[PDB]
């Protein structure tokens, strides 16, 4: 992805989300849109962004339901124009496979969320995360999400998935993660608040990128 | 809830969802709306149903993100008129607490999803589910979701949460669960396909209810 930087656009107002995304578009080719924006402004926001900005859109829907419901969510999401969808692995292999099947049908991609970045991830997800990643490998998943806040975990994830899999990583900036350290293991970093709450989002993005280029 | 039966309205077309819900409304007072319908028709569908049918709406959004994102999802969902939201416990206590805080702010309810009903739930969720339920109890959660497909698990869940907590249970009918057995432990059952794919949804609902009344 451009500059190895993915914007997490979690503003909840269309006007603010369009302003910030336009201001930083010279520095990214990929925007992650989640439920904060979609549930406030509608699924049509995905195609609007995709067209306006000529970006890739990752729908961060943390998909975490039974196979039949996951199927439906994925189909609605790809019908709305998303390039990829983020799926939890904790519901197990049939739930993941359901999403992979729809992505295969519709020519899209699944990202498997393996271990989360926030403190509560230590309670239950972290102990399962290596197995969740191995399950991904055995299902043929090629794209993964793991935590900037724990680069030792992010290194173990990378070890499981191999060098050819694509790994993106949230938790940079606001949550405490570091761009450069995270990019030792991840292919791209996700950044939300450190850019979209900045007084100058373009300057915030540019500053991050200047630290990425130095790598 | 009326007749201890909650409709899972996972049709993806507004006209079909309104037809079926209207046909079975004499038999329920509570509809569960999830992402299949909301991502196809918009969040406005919640208030439309709530008003048209004078039902309670549970937003089944399987909320499974970091605390700050969960906050945003909950606020958008309650702003849309939902009475309650379903939240995963697997992301840990801070993610759950974030949802509880918004519900307290907005006079709404959280349901904690503890153990899922599909086969893949055995991989990772089932081994954590008793702890997830105990975490719920220690956070003050009063409403829970557990699986009709495993009534021995559903009994253990009930044992943890006590007799005063409210427990609802999906997996009845299509997934193999039985109404009467499930209602030995759950206060209400969730039913989707066995009603909404039936040639006569009202007759399907009535048949289920006639088996519930016999209990
Ligand atoms: C939960 C599914 O989505 C994610 O991508 C995600 C997983 C995770 O472990 N950590 C994480 O922060 N994210 C998401 O990535 C974004 C992080 O934004 P920020 O902390 O503001 O830089 C935000 O949308 C959050 O919901
Ligand atoms: C995943 C969050 O939501 C749920 O309520 C849920 C959890 C679970 O373990 N099992 C389960 O079936 N559900 C939901 O409950 C509904 C079951 O519908 P059905 O099987 O058609 O009777 C459906 O919306 C499904 O997504």
GROMACS .gro file of C-alpha atoms and ligand atoms in nm:
model
  482
    1UNK     CA    1   0.000   0.000   0.000
    2UNK     CA    2   0.116   0.350  -0.066
    3UNK     CA    3   0.374   0.448   0.194
    4UNK     CA    4   0.282   0.132   0.392
    5UNK     CA    5   0.016   0.348   0.565
    6UNK     CA    6  -0.357   0.271   0.584
    7UNK     CA    7  -0.592   0.538   0.722
    8UNK     CA    8  -0.850   0.414   0.978
    9UNK     CA    9  -1.135   0.655   0.900
   10UNK     CA   10  -1.343   0.634   1.217
   11UNK     CA   11  -1.495   0.979   1.213
   12UNK     CA   12  -1.873   0.950   1.229
   13UNK     CA   13  -1.969   1.250   1.013
   14UNK     CA   14  -1.955   1.228   0.631
   15UNK     CA   15  -1.834   1.587   0.593
   16UNK     CA   16  -1.551   1.547   0.845
   17UNK     CA   17  -1.454   1.201   0.706
   18UNK     CA   18  -1.440   1.336   0.350
   19UNK     CA   19  -1.238   1.643   0.457
   20UNK     CA   20  -0.973   1.445   0.641
   21UNK     CA   21  -0.947   1.167   0.382
   22UNK     CA   22  -0.908   1.424   0.102
   23UNK     CA   23  -0.639   1.608   0.299
   24UNK     CA   24  -0.426   1.293   0.344
   25UNK     CA   25  -0.498   1.117   0.012
   26UNK     CA   26  -0.165   1.221  -0.140
   27UNK     CA   27   0.000   0.999   0.129
   28UNK     CA   28  -0.215   0.670   0.118
   29UNK     CA   29  -0.382   0.439  -0.140
   30UNK     CA   30  -0.593   0.250   0.113
   31UNK     CA   31  -0.862   0.348   0.364
   32UNK     CA   32  -1.007   0.122   0.632
   33UNK     CA   33  -1.377   0.203   0.692
   34UNK     CA   34  -1.551   0.043   0.988
   35UNK     CA   35  -1.884   0.045   1.158
   36UNK     CA   36  -1.846   0.390   1.326
   37UNK     CA   37  -1.867   0.556   0.983
   38UNK     CA   38  -2.088   0.300   0.806
   39UNK     CA   39  -2.353   0.287   1.082
   40UNK     CA   40  -2.363   0.669   1.093
   41UNK     CA   41  -2.367   0.742   0.718
   42UNK     CA   42  -2.469   0.418   0.539
   43UNK     CA   43  -2.298   0.154   0.329
   44UNK     CA   44  -2.306   0.390   0.028
   45UNK     CA   45  -2.012   0.569   0.188
   46UNK     CA   46  -1.784   0.286   0.073
   47UNK     CA   47  -1.849   0.336  -0.299
   48UNK     CA   48  -1.844   0.713  -0.251
   49UNK     CA   49  -1.495   0.701  -0.102
   50UNK     CA   50  -1.371   0.444  -0.347
   51UNK     CA   51  -1.476   0.670  -0.640
   52UNK     CA   52  -1.392   1.012  -0.494
   53UNK     CA   53  -1.050   0.916  -0.373
   54UNK     CA   54  -0.966   0.628  -0.609
   55UNK     CA   55  -0.850   0.430  -0.305
   56UNK     CA   56  -0.874   0.067  -0.197
   57UNK     CA   57  -1.133   0.020   0.083
   58UNK     CA   58  -1.095  -0.236   0.358
   59UNK     CA   59  -1.427  -0.288   0.541
   60UNK     CA   60  -1.330  -0.335   0.903
   61UNK     CA   61  -1.639  -0.522   1.016
   62UNK     CA   62  -1.460  -0.754   1.266
   63UNK     CA   63  -1.689  -1.025   1.133
   64UNK     CA   64  -1.766  -1.261   1.418
   65UNK     CA   65  -2.086  -1.460   1.357
   66UNK     CA   66  -2.196  -1.809   1.258
   67UNK     CA   67  -2.112  -1.921   0.901
   68UNK     CA   68  -2.451  -1.842   0.747
   69UNK     CA   69  -2.462  -1.491   0.893
   70UNK     CA   70  -2.099  -1.426   0.801
   71UNK     CA   71  -2.185  -1.523   0.443
   72UNK     CA   72  -2.462  -1.260   0.433
   73UNK     CA   73  -2.244  -0.987   0.586
   74UNK     CA   74  -1.967  -1.053   0.337
   75UNK     CA   75  -2.196  -1.050   0.039
   76UNK     CA   76  -2.358  -0.719   0.148
   77UNK     CA   77  -2.012  -0.570   0.204
   78UNK     CA   78  -1.867  -0.669  -0.132
   79UNK     CA   79  -2.188  -0.562  -0.307
   80UNK     CA   80  -2.122  -0.217  -0.151
   81UNK     CA   81  -1.785  -0.208  -0.323
   82UNK     CA   82  -1.536  -0.300  -0.051
   83UNK     CA   83  -1.207  -0.452  -0.173
   84UNK     CA   84  -1.154  -0.658   0.140
   85UNK     CA   85  -1.316  -0.738   0.472
   86UNK     CA   86  -1.164  -0.801   0.818
   87UNK     CA   87  -1.284  -1.122   0.983
   88UNK     CA   88  -1.224  -1.252   1.337
   89UNK     CA   89  -1.064  -1.592   1.367
   90UNK     CA   90  -1.185  -1.661   1.725
   91UNK     CA   91  -1.526  -1.800   1.594
   92UNK     CA   92  -1.339  -2.082   1.433
   93UNK     CA   93  -1.271  -2.231   1.095
   94UNK     CA   94  -1.620  -2.269   0.952
   95UNK     CA   95  -1.695  -1.899   1.022
   96UNK     CA   96  -1.373  -1.800   0.846
   97UNK     CA   97  -1.433  -2.039   0.554
   98UNK     CA   98  -1.776  -1.888   0.496
   99UNK     CA   99  -1.613  -1.549   0.442
  100UNK     CA  100  -1.341  -1.698   0.219
  101UNK     CA  101  -1.607  -1.859   0.003
  102UNK     CA  102  -1.789  -1.534  -0.057
  103UNK     CA  103  -1.463  -1.355  -0.128
  104UNK     CA  104  -1.376  -1.627  -0.384
  105UNK     CA  105  -1.720  -1.587  -0.542
  106UNK     CA  106  -1.692  -1.212  -0.570
  107UNK     CA  107  -1.319  -1.171  -0.648
  108UNK     CA  108  -1.237  -1.003  -0.312
  109UNK     CA  109  -1.007  -1.060  -0.013
  110UNK     CA  110  -1.040  -1.159   0.349
  111UNK     CA  111  -0.807  -1.030   0.625
  112UNK     CA  112  -0.793  -1.253   0.932
  113UNK     CA  113  -0.778  -1.072   1.266
  114UNK     CA  114  -0.556  -1.292   1.486
  115UNK     CA  115  -0.471  -1.106   1.806
  116UNK     CA  116  -0.614  -0.766   1.900
  117UNK     CA  117  -0.421  -0.458   2.013
  118UNK     CA  118  -0.608  -0.342   2.324
  119UNK     CA  119  -0.535  -0.449   2.684
  120UNK     CA  120  -0.835  -0.684   2.709
  121UNK     CA  121  -0.694  -0.892   2.421
  122UNK     CA  122  -0.470  -1.053   2.684
  123UNK     CA  123  -0.765  -1.220   2.858
  124UNK     CA  124  -0.880  -1.468   2.596
  125UNK     CA  125  -0.759  -1.384   2.246
  126UNK     CA  126  -0.385  -1.381   2.304
  127UNK     CA  127  -0.380  -1.741   2.433
  128UNK     CA  128  -0.561  -1.858   2.118
  129UNK     CA  129  -0.388  -1.628   1.870
  130UNK     CA  130  -0.107  -1.855   1.752
  131UNK     CA  131  -0.360  -2.133   1.687
  132UNK     CA  132  -0.591  -1.884   1.512
  133UNK     CA  133  -0.303  -1.785   1.285
  134UNK     CA  134  -0.216  -2.148   1.211
  135UNK     CA  135  -0.583  -2.208   1.129
  136UNK     CA  136  -0.562  -1.920   0.885
  137UNK     CA  137  -0.260  -2.071   0.717
  138UNK     CA  138  -0.436  -2.407   0.687
  139UNK     CA  139  -0.745  -2.237   0.534
  140UNK     CA  140  -0.531  -2.060   0.275
  141UNK     CA  141  -0.570  -1.709   0.425
  142UNK     CA  142  -0.310  -1.474   0.281
  143UNK     CA  143  -0.388  -1.147   0.465
  144UNK     CA  144  -0.371  -1.098   0.842
  145UNK     CA  145  -0.412  -0.834   1.112
  146UNK     CA  146  -0.206  -0.830   1.433
  147UNK     CA  147  -0.119  -0.580   1.706
  148UNK     CA  148   0.126  -0.289   1.690
  149UNK     CA  149   0.109  -0.268   2.070
  150UNK     CA  150   0.285  -0.605   2.104
  151UNK     CA  151   0.567  -0.631   1.852
  152UNK     CA  152   0.690  -0.958   2.005
  153UNK     CA  153   0.343  -1.102   1.929
  154UNK     CA  154   0.350  -0.941   1.590
  155UNK     CA  155   0.689  -1.118   1.525
  156UNK     CA  156   0.547  -1.456   1.633
  157UNK     CA  157   0.245  -1.398   1.400
  158UNK     CA  158   0.479  -1.320   1.114
  159UNK     CA  159   0.675  -1.636   1.193
  160UNK     CA  160   0.357  -1.845   1.162
  161UNK     CA  161   0.219  -1.687   0.845
  162UNK     CA  162   0.547  -1.663   0.657
  163UNK     CA  163   0.708  -1.390   0.449
  164UNK     CA  164   0.467  -1.412   0.156
  165UNK     CA  165   0.150  -1.338   0.360
  166UNK     CA  166   0.041  -0.974   0.390
  167UNK     CA  167   0.020  -0.842   0.746
  168UNK     CA  168  -0.132  -0.511   0.851
  169UNK     CA  169  -0.122  -0.373   1.203
  170UNK     CA  170  -0.334  -0.131   1.407
  171UNK     CA  171  -0.251   0.027   1.742
  172UNK     CA  172   0.004   0.278   1.609
  173UNK     CA  173   0.006   0.621   1.778
  174UNK     CA  174  -0.295   0.661   2.004
  175UNK     CA  175  -0.275   0.308   2.144
  176UNK     CA  176   0.104   0.336   2.198
  177UNK     CA  177   0.251   0.145   1.903
  178UNK     CA  178   0.546   0.274   1.702
  179UNK     CA  179   0.549   0.297   1.322
  180UNK     CA  180   0.899   0.184   1.261
  181UNK     CA  181   0.906  -0.101   1.510
  182UNK     CA  182   0.571  -0.231   1.381
  183UNK     CA  183   0.701  -0.225   1.022
  184UNK     CA  184   0.983  -0.462   1.120
  185UNK     CA  185   0.711  -0.729   1.102
  186UNK     CA  186   0.398  -0.586   0.935
  187UNK     CA  187   0.381  -0.483   0.571
  188UNK     CA  188   0.160  -0.183   0.652
  189UNK     CA  189   0.042   0.008   0.954
  190UNK     CA  190  -0.310   0.124   1.025
  191UNK     CA  191  -0.338   0.471   1.178
  192UNK     CA  192  -0.660   0.638   1.290
  193UNK     CA  193  -0.670   0.903   1.566
  194UNK     CA  194  -0.307   1.018   1.536
  195UNK     CA  195  -0.406   1.138   1.189
  196UNK     CA  196  -0.780   1.212   1.199
  197UNK     CA  197  -0.782   1.397   1.533
  198UNK     CA  198  -0.467   1.595   1.452
  199UNK     CA  199  -0.491   1.970   1.407
  200UNK     CA  200  -0.327   1.908   1.065
  201UNK     CA  201  -0.393   1.554   0.942
  202UNK     CA  202  -0.178   1.593   0.635
  203UNK     CA  203   0.117   1.703   0.851
  204UNK     CA  204   0.053   1.410   1.088
  205UNK     CA  205   0.048   1.163   0.794
  206UNK     CA  206   0.357   1.325   0.639
  207UNK     CA  207   0.544   1.297   0.967
  208UNK     CA  208   0.463   0.929   0.999
  209UNK     CA  209   0.572   0.870   0.638
  210UNK     CA  210   0.901   1.053   0.688
  211UNK     CA  211   0.969   0.813   0.971
  212UNK     CA  212   0.869   0.513   0.746
  213UNK     CA  213   1.094   0.623   0.456
  214UNK     CA  214   1.387   0.641   0.698
  215UNK     CA  215   1.351   0.266   0.765
  216UNK     CA  216  -4.062  -1.152   2.597
  217UNK     CA  217  -4.392  -1.243   2.444
  218UNK     CA  218  -4.420  -1.620   2.420
  219UNK     CA  219  -4.047  -1.645   2.509
  220UNK     CA  220  -3.980  -1.620   2.132
  221UNK     CA  221  -3.755  -1.363   1.962
  222UNK     CA  222  -3.757  -1.342   1.581
  223UNK     CA  223  -3.411  -1.325   1.415
  224UNK     CA  224  -3.499  -1.113   1.111
  225UNK     CA  225  -3.210  -1.190   0.877
  226UNK     CA  226  -3.384  -1.138   0.547
  227UNK     CA  227  -3.192  -0.885   0.341
  228UNK     CA  228  -3.482  -0.715   0.161
  229UNK     CA  229  -3.695  -0.451   0.338
  230UNK     CA  230  -4.017  -0.566   0.171
  231UNK     CA  231  -3.965  -0.933   0.261
  232UNK     CA  232  -3.850  -0.845   0.618
  233UNK     CA  233  -4.156  -0.625   0.675
  234UNK     CA  234  -4.393  -0.890   0.532
  235UNK     CA  235  -4.264  -1.171   0.752
  236UNK     CA  236  -4.234  -0.960   1.068
  237UNK     CA  237  -4.591  -0.831   1.022
  238UNK     CA  238  -4.719  -1.185   0.969
  239UNK     CA  239  -4.568  -1.313   1.297
  240UNK     CA  240  -4.609  -1.000   1.514
  241UNK     CA  241  -4.913  -1.139   1.696
  242UNK     CA  242  -4.675  -1.406   1.839
  243UNK     CA  243  -4.362  -1.196   1.952
  244UNK     CA  244  -4.280  -0.862   2.122
  245UNK     CA  245  -3.912  -0.864   2.030
  246UNK     CA  246  -3.717  -0.872   1.704
  247UNK     CA  247  -3.343  -0.925   1.670
  248UNK     CA  248  -3.203  -0.726   1.374
  249UNK     CA  249  -2.845  -0.788   1.266
  250UNK     CA  250  -2.604  -0.680   1.002
  251UNK     CA  251  -2.761  -0.881   0.713
  252UNK     CA  252  -3.066  -0.651   0.721
  253UNK     CA  253  -2.896  -0.332   0.845
  254UNK     CA  254  -2.613  -0.342   0.589
  255UNK     CA  255  -2.864  -0.405   0.309
  256UNK     CA  256  -3.131  -0.150   0.407
  257UNK     CA  257  -2.968   0.100   0.649
  258UNK     CA  258  -2.983   0.173   1.020
  259UNK     CA  259  -3.316   0.353   0.970
  260UNK     CA  260  -3.473   0.008   0.949
  261UNK     CA  261  -3.444  -0.021   1.329
  262UNK     CA  262  -3.667   0.277   1.406
  263UNK     CA  263  -3.901   0.179   1.123
  264UNK     CA  264  -3.957  -0.165   1.275
  265UNK     CA  265  -3.976  -0.035   1.627
  266UNK     CA  266  -4.257   0.207   1.525
  267UNK     CA  267  -4.444  -0.010   1.273
  268UNK     CA  268  -4.455  -0.315   1.491
  269UNK     CA  269  -4.431  -0.159   1.838
  270UNK     CA  270  -4.168  -0.421   1.922
  271UNK     CA  271  -3.844  -0.422   2.122
  272UNK     CA  272  -3.537  -0.434   1.891
  273UNK     CA  273  -3.217  -0.613   1.983
  274UNK     CA  274  -2.931  -0.504   1.752
  275UNK     CA  275  -2.730  -0.819   1.696
  276UNK     CA  276  -2.402  -0.656   1.603
  277UNK     CA  277  -2.175  -0.918   1.769
  278UNK     CA  278  -1.966  -0.622   1.881
  279UNK     CA  279  -1.604  -0.731   1.888
  280UNK     CA  280  -1.365  -0.436   1.867
  281UNK     CA  281  -1.134  -0.233   2.089
  282UNK     CA  282  -1.300  -0.021   2.362
  283UNK     CA  283  -1.298   0.309   2.172
  284UNK     CA  284  -1.450   0.157   1.858
  285UNK     CA  285  -1.706  -0.040   2.060
  286UNK     CA  286  -1.809   0.289   2.223
  287UNK     CA  287  -1.877   0.444   1.881
  288UNK     CA  288  -2.070   0.141   1.752
  289UNK     CA  289  -2.289   0.137   2.061
  290UNK     CA  290  -2.365   0.504   2.047
  291UNK     CA  291  -2.460   0.485   1.675
  292UNK     CA  292  -2.680   0.183   1.747
  293UNK     CA  293  -2.869   0.336   2.037
  294UNK     CA  294  -2.906   0.664   1.846
  295UNK     CA  295  -3.082   0.452   1.578
  296UNK     CA  296  -3.334   0.339   1.837
  297UNK     CA  297  -3.220  -0.009   1.937
  298UNK     CA  298  -3.328  -0.125   2.284
  299UNK     CA  299  -3.028  -0.349   2.334
  300UNK     CA  300  -2.709  -0.459   2.163
  301UNK     CA  301  -2.530  -0.798   2.156
  302UNK     CA  302  -2.162  -0.779   2.246
  303UNK     CA  303  -1.892  -1.049   2.229
  304UNK     CA  304  -1.710  -1.125   2.551
  305UNK     CA  305  -1.402  -1.283   2.384
  306UNK     CA  306  -1.234  -0.934   2.337
  307UNK     CA  307  -1.215  -0.902   2.710
  308UNK     CA  308  -1.338  -0.687   2.991
  309UNK     CA  309  -1.244  -0.339   2.872
  310UNK     CA  310  -1.426  -0.396   2.540
  311UNK     CA  311  -1.736  -0.510   2.729
  312UNK     CA  312  -1.714  -0.224   2.980
  313UNK     CA  313  -1.704   0.029   2.697
  314UNK     CA  314  -2.040  -0.101   2.575
  315UNK     CA  315  -2.185  -0.106   2.928
  316UNK     CA  316  -2.084   0.255   2.974
  317UNK     CA  317  -2.264   0.370   2.664
  318UNK     CA  318  -2.570   0.167   2.755
  319UNK     CA  319  -2.569   0.332   3.101
  320UNK     CA  320  -2.539   0.674   2.937
  321UNK     CA  321  -2.826   0.613   2.700
  322UNK     CA  322  -3.061   0.405   2.919
  323UNK     CA  323  -3.017   0.083   2.712
  324UNK     CA  324  -2.904  -0.277   2.765
  325UNK     CA  325  -2.611  -0.494   2.670
  326UNK     CA  326  -2.640  -0.870   2.602
  327UNK     CA  327  -2.314  -1.059   2.644
  328UNK     CA  328  -2.251  -1.336   2.390
  329UNK     CA  329  -2.067  -1.608   2.586
  330UNK     CA  330  -2.046  -1.924   2.374
  331UNK     CA  331  -2.164  -1.946   2.013
  332UNK     CA  332  -2.394  -2.209   1.862
  333UNK     CA  333  -2.212  -2.319   1.545
  334UNK     CA  334  -1.961  -2.606   1.518
  335UNK     CA  335  -1.655  -2.379   1.500
  336UNK     CA  336  -1.739  -2.239   1.845
  337UNK     CA  337  -1.573  -2.552   1.983
  338UNK     CA  338  -1.229  -2.445   1.859
  339UNK     CA  339  -1.160  -2.140   2.073
  340UNK     CA  340  -1.475  -1.990   2.225
  341UNK     CA  341  -1.604  -2.289   2.417
  342UNK     CA  342  -1.284  -2.325   2.622
  343UNK     CA  343  -1.308  -1.958   2.727
  344UNK     CA  344  -1.685  -1.940   2.766
  345UNK     CA  345  -1.719  -2.014   3.137
  346UNK     CA  346  -1.456  -1.748   3.212
  347UNK     CA  347  -1.629  -1.506   2.973
  348UNK     CA  348  -1.954  -1.560   3.162
  349UNK     CA  349  -1.785  -1.508   3.499
  350UNK     CA  350  -1.632  -1.188   3.362
  351UNK     CA  351  -1.982  -1.077   3.269
  352UNK     CA  352  -2.106  -1.142   3.619
  353UNK     CA  353  -1.816  -0.945   3.765
  354UNK     CA  354  -1.888  -0.652   3.528
  355UNK     CA  355  -2.253  -0.645   3.632
  356UNK     CA  356  -2.391  -0.782   3.301
  357UNK     CA  357  -2.749  -0.897   3.345
  358UNK     CA  358  -2.833  -1.026   2.994
  359UNK     CA  359  -2.656  -1.312   2.817
  360UNK     CA  360  -2.663  -1.518   2.497
  361UNK     CA  361  -2.568  -1.887   2.485
  362UNK     CA  362  -2.619  -2.181   2.248
  363UNK     CA  363  -2.935  -2.386   2.192
  364UNK     CA  364  -2.721  -2.645   2.013
  365UNK     CA  365  -2.545  -2.736   2.339
  366UNK     CA  366  -2.797  -2.748   2.624
  367UNK     CA  367  -2.535  -2.888   2.865
  368UNK     CA  368  -2.330  -2.571   2.796
  369UNK     CA  369  -2.641  -2.363   2.822
  370UNK     CA  370  -2.703  -2.522   3.171
  371UNK     CA  371  -2.346  -2.445   3.283
  372UNK     CA  372  -2.391  -2.082   3.161
  373UNK     CA  373  -2.712  -2.054   3.358
  374UNK     CA  374  -2.534  -2.193   3.662
  375UNK     CA  375  -2.270  -1.919   3.638
  376UNK     CA  376  -2.503  -1.625   3.574
  377UNK     CA  377  -2.771  -1.722   3.824
  378UNK     CA  378  -3.150  -1.731   3.809
  379UNK     CA  379  -3.201  -1.355   3.802
  380UNK     CA  380  -2.996  -1.292   3.484
  381UNK     CA  381  -3.182  -1.297   3.151
  382UNK     CA  382  -3.057  -1.556   2.902
  383UNK     CA  383  -3.158  -1.579   2.537
  384UNK     CA  384  -3.053  -1.857   2.304
  385UNK     CA  385  -3.010  -1.895   1.927
  386UNK     CA  386  -2.960  -2.214   1.729
  387UNK     CA  387  -3.320  -2.337   1.753
  388UNK     CA  388  -3.459  -2.514   1.444
  389UNK     CA  389  -3.225  -2.472   1.149
  390UNK     CA  390  -2.909  -2.527   1.353
  391UNK     CA  391  -3.060  -2.831   1.532
  392UNK     CA  392  -3.164  -2.693   1.872
  393UNK     CA  393  -3.498  -2.775   2.033
  394UNK     CA  394  -3.736  -2.512   2.172
  395UNK     CA  395  -3.845  -2.693   2.480
  396UNK     CA  396  -3.507  -2.827   2.585
  397UNK     CA  397  -3.347  -2.483   2.534
  398UNK     CA  398  -3.617  -2.320   2.751
  399UNK     CA  399  -3.518  -2.545   3.041
  400UNK     CA  400  -3.227  -2.302   3.080
  401UNK     CA  401  -3.287  -1.992   2.865
  402UNK     CA  402  -3.563  -1.739   2.929
  403UNK     CA  403  -3.626  -1.694   2.555
  404UNK     CA  404  -3.531  -1.856   2.231
  405UNK     CA  405  -3.417  -1.683   1.915
  406UNK     CA  406  -3.555  -1.828   1.592
  407UNK     CA  407  -3.465  -1.712   1.241
  408UNK     CA  408  -3.484  -1.944   0.937
  409UNK     CA  409  -3.737  -2.191   1.079
  410UNK     CA  410  -3.979  -1.898   1.077
  411UNK     CA  411  -3.862  -1.659   0.803
  412UNK     CA  412  -3.794  -1.924   0.536
  413UNK     CA  413  -4.115  -2.116   0.612
  414UNK     CA  414  -4.389  -2.129   0.352
  415UNK     CA  415  -4.616  -1.991   0.629
  416UNK     CA  416  -4.415  -1.800   0.891
  417UNK     CA  417  -4.714  -1.738   1.112
  418UNK     CA  418  -4.792  -2.111   1.118
  419UNK     CA  419  -4.424  -2.187   1.192
  420UNK     CA  420  -4.422  -1.936   1.482
  421UNK     CA  421  -4.758  -2.066   1.611
  422UNK     CA  422  -4.629  -2.421   1.607
  423UNK     CA  423  -4.322  -2.329   1.806
  424UNK     CA  424  -4.538  -2.139   2.058
  425UNK     CA  425  -4.778  -2.431   2.099
  426UNK     CA  426  -4.477  -2.638   2.193
  427UNK     CA  427  -4.358  -2.362   2.439
  428UNK     CA  428  -4.700  -2.330   2.609
  429UNK     CA  429  -4.698  -2.706   2.669
  430UNK     CA  430  -4.385  -2.667   2.885
  431LIG     C1  431  -1.175  -0.526   1.562
  431LIG     C2  432  -1.162  -0.528   1.409
  431LIG     O1  433  -1.075  -0.422   1.358
  431LIG     C3  434  -0.944  -0.367   1.358
  431LIG     O2  435  -0.890  -0.340   1.254
  431LIG     C4  436  -0.875  -0.341   1.486
  431LIG     C5  437  -0.832  -0.453   1.557
  431LIG     C6  438  -0.747  -0.435   1.664
  431LIG     O3  439  -0.696  -0.529   1.730
  431LIG     N1  440  -0.712  -0.309   1.697
  431LIG     C7  441  -0.757  -0.198   1.633
  431LIG     O4  442  -0.723  -0.086   1.674
  431LIG     N2  443  -0.840  -0.213   1.527
  431LIG     C8  444  -0.899  -0.094   1.459
  431LIG     O5  445  -0.798  -0.017   1.399
  431LIG     C9  446  -0.822   0.123   1.424
  431LIG    C10  447  -0.719   0.178   1.520
  431LIG     O6  448  -0.737   0.320   1.517
  431LIG     P1  449  -0.647   0.418   1.610
  431LIG     O7  450  -0.620   0.349   1.741
  431LIG     O8  451  -0.736   0.539   1.624
  431LIG     O9  452  -0.519   0.445   1.535
  431LIG    C11  453  -0.964   0.129   1.477
  431LIG    O10  454  -1.060   0.133   1.369
  431LIG    C12  455  -0.979  -0.004   1.549
  431LIG    O11  456  -1.116  -0.041   1.564
  432LIG     C1  457  -2.283  -1.361   1.654
  432LIG     C2  458  -2.376  -1.261   1.725
  432LIG     O1  459  -2.516  -1.302   1.722
  432LIG     C3  460  -2.611  -1.402   1.759
  432LIG     O2  461  -2.713  -1.369   1.813
  432LIG     C4  462  -2.585  -1.543   1.729
  432LIG     C5  463  -2.484  -1.605   1.804
  432LIG     C6  464  -2.471  -1.742   1.798
  432LIG     O3  465  -2.391  -1.808   1.867
  432LIG     N1  466  -2.554  -1.810   1.716
  432LIG     C7  467  -2.649  -1.752   1.637
  432LIG     O4  468  -2.717  -1.822   1.561
  432LIG     N2  469  -2.664  -1.617   1.642
  432LIG     C8  470  -2.760  -1.548   1.551
  432LIG     O5  471  -2.891  -1.588   1.580
  432LIG     C9  472  -2.963  -1.611   1.457
  432LIG    C10  473  -2.989  -1.760   1.439
  432LIG     O6  474  -3.082  -1.768   1.329
  432LIG     P1  475  -3.134  -1.912   1.276
  432LIG     O7  476  -3.022  -2.011   1.286
  432LIG     O8  477  -3.172  -1.880   1.132
  432LIG     O9  478  -3.252  -1.952   1.361
  432LIG    C11  479  -2.875  -1.553   1.348
  432LIG    O10  480  -2.899  -1.411   1.334
  432LIG    C12  481  -2.735  -1.572   1.405
  432LIG    O11  482  -2.642  -1.482   1.345
   0.00000   0.00000   0.00000
